[PDB]
Write an enzyme that holds these catalytic residues in place. Structure first.
Site, PDB file in Angstrom:
ATOM      1  N   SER B  49       0.834  -1.025   0.239  1.00  0.00           N
ATOM      2  CA  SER B  49       0.369   0.316   0.086  1.00  0.00           C
ATOM      3  C   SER B  49       0.780   1.613  -0.267  1.00  0.00           C
ATOM      4  CB  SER B  49      -1.293   0.215   1.529  1.00  0.00           C
ATOM      5  OG  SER B  49       0.022   0.132   2.256  1.00  0.00           O
ATOM      6  N   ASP B  82      -0.408  -1.271  -4.350  1.00  0.00           N
ATOM      7  CA  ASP B  82      -2.085  -1.530  -3.630  1.00  0.00           C
ATOM      8  C   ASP B  82      -2.559  -0.095  -3.531  1.00  0.00           C
ATOM      9  OD1 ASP B  82      -4.195  -2.522  -2.983  1.00  0.00           O
ATOM     10  OD2 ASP B  82      -3.981  -2.769  -0.960  1.00  0.00           O
ATOM     11  N   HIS B  83      -3.829  -0.083  -4.505  1.00  0.00           N
ATOM     12  CA  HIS B  83      -4.543   1.255  -3.924  1.00  0.00           C
ATOM     13  C   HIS B  83      -3.542   2.275  -4.479  1.00  0.00           C
ATOM     14  CE1 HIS B  83      -7.758  -1.493  -2.829  1.00  0.00           C
ATOM     15  NE2 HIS B  83      -8.816  -0.422  -3.064  1.00  0.00           N
TER      16      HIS B  83
HETATM   17 NA    NA Z   1      -4.657  -3.531  -5.097  1.00  0.00          NA
HETATM   18 ZN   LIG Z   2     -10.631  -1.216  -3.379  1.00  0.00          ZN
END
Ligand code: NA
Ligand SMILES: [Zn+2]
Ligand code: NA
Ligand SMILES: [Zn+2]
Lengths: 290, 290
Positions: B49, B82-83
């Site tokens: 993330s 991620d995101h």
């Molecule tokens: Na993702």
């Molecule tokens: Zn999502």
């Protein structure tokens, strides 16, 4: 950047200050140590024990240090094998990229300790790596002979701590005049083992979080200061870092039973460890030496 | 070795299985994920993330993964942002060596989500990096148009989890026929967000160690299996890892107040996390796919 251990310790030897040698077992410990060195403008002597190397893998231990060096290229950094127990462990560390190795044969008699230390020295010096050995209290004239014949770069003499082959029950006491005699006869950087100095705030943090330090005391700051005055240039520091770090982990666990974000545990843990390192650099006199 | 994300997910798409996409924030999580993939002969999607990247530093996040890939060169590994929330974050991840990036603009209207996603895709594809986006429940005809125009490699459609821009109150329920429609119209690998399972054994370990799971419930394993049956090929997995890991940290703290060896906390925590990963690989169908 990454430098041989003797480069850091010979400066400390000449100028009469101590360099903390800070153990790590993972990323969080290593990051906090580096940030401390950056904030105090101090050289970094980074240690990995044999158990830490098994835990991380030697490729990861060296690899993470190299990444951190590149992040702080102005900081001199040595990467040291702490309490290597065999020639082969020292050789593997040399091959992996360590810049200092310690061979601990201090539980052996003088001849066997000298023989194994000399073999490690021959191998390490051929690769440009510096070497620490350990000797015990120590007889200064034996230390003189040991250093001269082995060509070891730095020595951990038994000078009053309860540690390793020289454990005893009772309040530790620094043999300052013995230390000064070892220093005068060997004329190399000297290393202090077994001198955990659990600062009051770290102790309080750990106990407040529910911890138990089972009558474990360490030594007072004055012990460390007097040791530097007498010629100690490397002060092994591990226990104090772990207590500070785990105190914060325990605190987070206690105060929010729903907390499972690892960063919420380990960000405060890093900060507490970093602060132990910073204060120790100031105490020993390596702050503002870069 | 380290490979483009679509290399792993196109195979999963063609053969109808799911690949766990496991988050890490430090060495312990990463090591456990890799050992699981080695033990289950499974390809690995490793996720970081934006918060994890800030915590580790992007140099350390990529650098540790590269060390692990060299330790296990037979395992296909994708390293995935991620995101990601901005073009610039995605671009920094590409430049640092990620092989997959997710841009989450699912809180924007279709036009703006498509515009930003398309901009990320052009940059990432020029660098040989695959891209994920998110869209929401989702209208399958909008998903069809979104994929065609953006040329995104995989899509996270809103299909019944309470997550991100699609949080609701009440029981999450997989819209299986909607999933199949999205799958038929887009014909690309699909991604499931917000589907924590919280397995019974993991819940038991966390609560036995004094934890509180604040009325958080996981989706049944049946949810995950039916999702794969419907065309899900990537299953984001973070919460389940953290709960299992921190349960063991809490247990160690509880059972020995004098314990401050980090390895004593984190070796059992790694083992618990590793076992969650292994079981998820088996459940989703990526075991024995190397
Ligand atoms: Na993702
Ligand atoms: Zn999502
Ligand atoms: Na040492
Ligand atoms: Zn020792």
């Amino acid at each position: 950047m990454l430098v041989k251990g003797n480069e850091i310790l010979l400066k400390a030897h000449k100028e009469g200050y101590g360099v903390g040698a800070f153990n790590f077992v993972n990323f969080e410990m290593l990051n906090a140590i580096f940030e401390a060195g950056n904030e105090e403008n101090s050289p970094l002597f980074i240690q990995a024990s044999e158990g830490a190397i098994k835990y991380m893998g030697i490729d990861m231990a060296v690899g993470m240090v190299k990444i951190m060096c590149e992040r702080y290229p102005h900081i001199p950094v040595a990467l040291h094998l702490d309490h290597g127990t065999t020639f082969e462990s020292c050789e593997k560390a040399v091959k992996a990229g360590f810049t200092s190795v310690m061979i601990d044969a201090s539980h052996h008699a003088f001849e066997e300790n000298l023989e194994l230390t000399s073999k490690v020295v021959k191998m390490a010096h051929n690769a440009g790596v510096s070497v620490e050995a350990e000797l015990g209290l120590v007889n200064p004239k034996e230390a003189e002979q040991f250093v001269k014949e082995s060509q070891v770069d730095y020595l951990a003499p038994a000078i009053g701590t309860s540690h390793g082959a020289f454990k005893f029950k009772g309040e530790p006491k620094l043999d300052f005049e013995r230390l000064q005699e070892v220093k005068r006869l060997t004329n190399i950087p000297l290393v202090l083992h077994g001198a955990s100095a659990i600062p009051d705030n770290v102790r309080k943090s750990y106990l407040d979080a529910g911890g138990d330090l089972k009558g474990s005391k360490g030594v007072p700051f004055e012990f460390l200061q007097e040791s530097v005055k007498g010629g100690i240039n490397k002060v092994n520091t591990d226990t104090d870092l772990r207590i500070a770090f785990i105190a914060e982990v325990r605190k987070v666990a206690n105060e929010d039973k729903s907390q499972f974000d690892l960063r919420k545990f380990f960000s405060p843990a890093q900060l507490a460890l970093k602060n132990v390192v910073k204060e120790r650099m100031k105490l020993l006199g390596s702050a503002n030496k870069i």
